[PDB]
Design a protein around this ligand. Sequence first.
Ligand SMILES: [Mg+2]
Ligand SMILES: [Mg+2]
Ligand SMILES: [Zn+2]
Ligand SMILES: [Zn+2]
Ligand SMILES: [Zn+2]
Ligand SMILES: [Zn+2]
Lengths: 162, 162
Amino acid sequence: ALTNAQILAVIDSWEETVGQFPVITHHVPLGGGLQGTLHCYEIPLAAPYGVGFAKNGPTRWQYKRTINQVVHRWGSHTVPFLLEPDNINGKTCTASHLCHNTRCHNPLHLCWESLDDNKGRNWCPGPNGGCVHAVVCLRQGPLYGPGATVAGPQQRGSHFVV
Amino acid sequence: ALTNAQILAVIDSWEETVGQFPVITHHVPLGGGLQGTLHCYEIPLAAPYGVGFAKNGPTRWQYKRTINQVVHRWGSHTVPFLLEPDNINGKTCTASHLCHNTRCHNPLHLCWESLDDNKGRNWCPGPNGGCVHAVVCLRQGPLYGPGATVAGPQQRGSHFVV
DNA sequence: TTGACTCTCTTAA
DNA sequence: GAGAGTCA
DNA sequence: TTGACTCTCTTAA
DNA sequence: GAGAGTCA
Ligand SMILES: [Mg+2]
Ligand SMILES: [Mg+2]
Ligand SMILES: [Zn+2]
Ligand SMILES: [Zn+2]
Ligand SMILES: [Zn+2]
Ligand SMILES: [Zn+2]
């Protein structure tokens, strides 16, 4: 809601509720052949999810509170960042999972960044493999690696140079 | 169905036409602070584009040939790969620009890979910066770097551990 | 047979 | 990665 | 007021 | 990153 006090209240109620989600240990690649452990606070798979939470998509949730007798609703991972700018360089800020685990609502696993920055973490070599993200990755991105390219650059004739 | 000879003739006519596209010299980051040069064969900004070519979107084109009274049409960057498998690991193969220049139709700047592999090249450190793509990048990805994250992981209380 | 437009679609964050 | 509506 | 569903949308490859 | 229709 409009007031800073009301926004802090939303963040605090969200943190209390999410803090009661099951804590699931995930062992993750860090890059550089190293492994670490993350503690994700995972929203339940089915209703009930927790006070204020409802599922709007297979892996999409929303947080809802009644303030000033009106319903205020946010994407469930956006709540930690309600006091932050909602854009950067003209690009919309998104909640971005450092653990790449959409059910996780641990704010220590979330950052607030452009969708491009968000996506790019999928391929990051990780905090022990050369991550250069200013807000550092918690793990190597799940899509990091050589890829599975079927065909490389090629020509039949002699019309082209690299 | 088109024979492999007919497909080869399509690829040859496409190469002949694209080989007359304006060749533009671009200086690009390779990673590791090194700069290099790519030579892109750029489809024109407006019609006419070249024999067989037509624009179906802001940065989308198609190549069309009529063979024995039947009209055949392909995505304009897919033609080099018509003799290749069209899927891998259950994922559709996509034309993927190693030069990240959609107007370019230089087949020496294209590969054929999943959309995930394609996207991930946007953040690659580049052939002189640590690229691990089996079909190596030609340049550092345009989105490589520290990013512009607005807010990092944070909590107000003590409900969470990382 | 061809050019130059038109429209909607896929994927996974 | 999002916002918003329909019910009970 | 709160819960549990429904729908479509955004972005840039 | 795609496929397909209309019209002359
Ligand atoms: Mg993400
Ligand atoms: Mg690409
Ligand atoms: Zn997590
Ligand atoms: Zn990183
Ligand atoms: Zn090129
Ligand atoms: Zn690469």
